[PDB]
Amino acid sequence: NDELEIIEGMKFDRGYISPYFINTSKGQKCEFQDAYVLLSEKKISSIQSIVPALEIANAHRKPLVIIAEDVDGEALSTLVLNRLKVGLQVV
């Protein structure tokens, strides 16, 4: 049968970089409410460029979604480590 699907909001067809950020088992989704959004035009590589955003997010106890050109090894390692060992809400 034919179907009609309505897509609302802003859907841009890009997935999570690492499976470690998933926090919802049913459906394999990373879901957050009242999240900060960090928009980066250029690639994020170094730990200095990424740590301040994590500090700001953790100070206010809010999740953080980082939309960027790409995330490199050092920053990604910091993100996954903090998410796994602290429960930091990041994606």
């Binding site: 730990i47 740590v51 500090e55 953790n58 100070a59 050092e74 390692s77 910091t78 903090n82 060992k85």
Partner: protein, 100 residues
């Protein structure tokens, strides 16, 4: 000269111990163990007897055991005492000294 764990530097060499690297920022952000690299803060644990590079009588080393020093980022010789790592520099290589 002043010995340390039965080891005595020769001439103007100084044996120092590097401080522990930071693992958590001033906030709550923890750091990967591969990102700290090398730290330039050290404490002097052993001192040699005197400088052979001085003409005539040899001069004493300019630092004393227990001082906190700022090291260069390129020098140092690795030694192991009681399975702990210490670094041997020349008295002229130490960049600076901290005071309290």
């Amino acid at each position: 000269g002043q010995a340390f764990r039965k080891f005595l530097p020769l001439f103007d060499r100084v044996l120092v111990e590097r401080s522990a690297a930071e693992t958590v920022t001033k906030g709550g952000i923890m750091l990967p163990e591969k990102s700290q690299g090398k730290v330039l803060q050290a404490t002097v644990v052993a001192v040699g007897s005197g400088s052979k590079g001085k003409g005539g009588e040899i001069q004493p080393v300019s630092v004393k055991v227990g001082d906190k020093v700022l090291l260069p980022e390129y020098g140092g010789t690795k030694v192991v005492l009681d399975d702990k790592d210490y670094f041997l520099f020349r008295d002229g290589d130490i960049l600076g000294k901290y005071v309290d």
